[PDB]
């Protein structure tokens, strides 16, 4: 095994980095872009789709977590299958599934079938990072590989900004009407289509063929890589004189056995310590990262809610008689009023409350209320014609001789720009971290860079209390996102270089499934901290990153070594 790797490294080391490596970089960055787009689709869609689809808070949470659950299943499944079948073929299959179900997710009305479609889309896109990083690792020489794999993660933010821009440019056109958010989903499903469009024109990695005892195919693939690179390099005349490289229902059962055996061999005597340390590192970093990134927007929303409550105005002791009103109101409180013989036609309300009032012989007509309530009010001989006033809108009230007529239809649930801008800021703030990590991975080292980024993030977590205003949260989120990305780039580079080529996609995929599993738990735990002491998330995220840092330092070193 060690003898084959030395020979293979020489073939790529002599030929050098040419057009082929760049072409593959782009056609794989397309798939990473597809993943980066898919991660935000449900997030940007909930506020708009909450009305049409009659969604409650529990449904909002389930829709939030379904993408991560699908990615969790898909990472393991495609990682296991890629080793036995290949990298190109499994990437094609996974991305085709993603694109097809994402396309069918826009023309869906029901909530359960929408959840099912998003789950299958997540399953499809789950196999992006494992197959992409592995399949590209086999065209790079040890002279410079840490740098090359780091630039490969620059496309995830491209996907993120693409999704944010389309959300900003498609969602706010509420007047299109099938509403706009479906068109936004359809637009966001295009990167996967481009991924299959480009990926079908690239070869399967030589290493898979060599490991499967198909040396002829590896030879022709290396011949193609040599030809493409020599077509426009300094020296085009040298011929590929390298001879052959060293040679080393039923199908369903065979694949099931082989995938299980490959997964089990990762816990063997030689890959026990490495697997345990990587499990710990992946779990702890994923937990903190997802917890903080979903905790910041919730805090911003909470602060905005507090400011809105502080902006409310009260109107006490109003008496009205024989008047008509047709003017909108928002964020007001009316206490202790007396209305007799009034009319209310074409009235719109938003976060308006009425306390201790009294309506006698009134008449409502075409009134829509959002977060509007009647507390301790009294109605006598009042008529409600074509109104949205539901049963729960009256609290501690008494109705005498009143009547509802021609009641409106719609979702009975009561909940019938900043997010986009904040998400764009974070996705752009992850840039300098990526640049420094890419330029200094092979110089500083994978282990040192991982440890430094992890401890820096853990220390920066302590300054959460320093920011209390709305502007401070944005800066803190940007600072955390921009400095913690190097930790993930180093981890992706480290996980590839540790396991052998026979297991790298299975081993990377298993750990990525753990990453998604930890993300779900972190999201669930951190969403409930709001309304509680600010020190709790600080303590949790600091302890998690500390445990990650110690374990990460305890791993071995891989810089400057053949990819065995």
């Amino acid at each position, epitope marked *: 095994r060690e003898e084959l790797a030395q020979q293979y490294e020489a073939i790529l080391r002599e030929c050098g980095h040419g057009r082929f490596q760049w072409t593959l970089y782009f056609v794989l960055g397309l798939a990473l872009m597809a993943d980066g787009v898919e991660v935000f689709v449900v997030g940007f869609v909930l506020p708009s789709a909450e009305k049409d689809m009659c969604l409650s808070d529990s449904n909002k949470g389930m829709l939030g977590l379904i993408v991560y659950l699908g990615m969790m299943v898909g990472a393991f499944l495609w990682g296991g299958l890629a080793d036995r079948l290949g990298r190109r073929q499994c990437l094609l299959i996974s991305l085709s599934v993603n694109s097809v179900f994402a396309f069918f997710s826009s023309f869906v009305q029901g909530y359960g079938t929408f959840l099912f479609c998003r789950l299958l889309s997540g399953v499809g896109i789950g196999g992006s990072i494992p197959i992409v990083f592995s399949y590209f690792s086999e065209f790079l020489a040890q002279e410079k590989r840490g740098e090359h794999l780091s630039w490969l993660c620059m496309f995830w933010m491209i996907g993120g900004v693409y999704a944010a821009a389309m959300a900003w440019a498609i969602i706010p056109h509420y007047g299109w009407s099938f509403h706009s958010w479906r068109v936004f989903v359809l637009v966001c499903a295009f990167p996967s289509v481009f991924a299959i469009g480009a990926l079908t024109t690239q070869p399967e990695s030589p290493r898979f063929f060599l490991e499967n005892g198909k040396h002829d195919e590896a030879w022709m693939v290396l011949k193609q890589v040599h030809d493409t690179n020599m077509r426009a390099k300094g020296h085009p005349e040298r011929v590929f004189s390298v001879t052959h490289i060293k040679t080393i229902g039923v199908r369903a059962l065979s694949l099931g056995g082989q995938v299980w055996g490959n997964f089990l061999s990762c816990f063997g005597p030689e890959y026990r310590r490495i697997t345990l340390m990587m499990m710990g590192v992946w779990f702890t970093m994923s937990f903190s990262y997802y917890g903080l990134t979903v905790w910041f927007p919730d805090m911003i929303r909470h602060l905005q809610a507090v400011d809105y409550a502080a902006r409310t105005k009260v109107f006490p002791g109003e008496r009205v008689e024989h008047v008509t009103f047709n003017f909108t109101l928002e964020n007001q409180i009316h206490r202790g009023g007396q209305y007799f013989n009034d009319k209310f036609i074409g009235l719109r309300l938003k976060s308006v409350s009425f306390e201790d009032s009294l309506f006698e012989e009134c008449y409502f007509e075409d009134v829509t209320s959002s977060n509007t309530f009647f507390r301790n009010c009294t109605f006598i001989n009042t008529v409600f014609y074509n109104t949205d006033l539901f049963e729960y809108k009256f609290v501690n*009230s008494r109705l005498v001789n009143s009547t509802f007529l021609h009641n409106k239809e719609g979702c*009975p649930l009561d909940v019938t720009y900043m997010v986009y801008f904040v998400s764009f800021l974070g996705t752009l703030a992850v840039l300098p971290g990526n640049i420094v990590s890419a330029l200094l991975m092979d110089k500083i080292g994978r282990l040192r860079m991982l440890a430094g980024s992890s401890v820096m993030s853990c220390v920066s977590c302590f300054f959460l209390s320093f920011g209390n205003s709305e502007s401070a949260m944005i800066a803190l989120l940007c600072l955390f996102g921009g400095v913690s990305i190097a930790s993930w780039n180093a981890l992706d580079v480290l996980t590839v270089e540790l396991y052998p080529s026979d297991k790298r996609t299975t081993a990377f995929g298993f750990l990525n499934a753990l990453c998604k599993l930890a993300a779900v738990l972190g999201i669930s735990i951190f969403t409930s901290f709001v309304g509680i002491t600010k020190a709790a998330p600080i303590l949790f995220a600091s302890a998690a990153l500390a445990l990650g840092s110690s374990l990460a330092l305890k791993l071995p070193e891989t810089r400057g070594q053949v990819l065995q």
Partner: nanobody
Amino acid sequence: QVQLVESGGGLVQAGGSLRLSCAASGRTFSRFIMGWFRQAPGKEREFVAAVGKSGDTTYYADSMSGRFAISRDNAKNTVYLQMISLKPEDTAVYYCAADSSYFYHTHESEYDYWGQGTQVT
């Protein structure tokens, strides 16, 4: 299917007071707008009073505010209709109904389930 039964009726001297208890069954009881209907001899069912899904708001019919009081107890899963100053005109079979809609309604067609009914003299 929610099963409703009413009890607490019985002959009452003029000007007295009486109570009727409408007990439901099943966990799903906070998702219905409870009501009370009565059917006098020779007349059709007429809506009397109703209470909200949380017991906070009441909904009385014309002239039924002052003699009839309606309340619900979620802990015991039951509804109470207190009547005072009973006159001979208040002779009927008082039914207990359930409505799953999100609006207060007086028509009997809108209400989903019904009760066995009890006689009040």
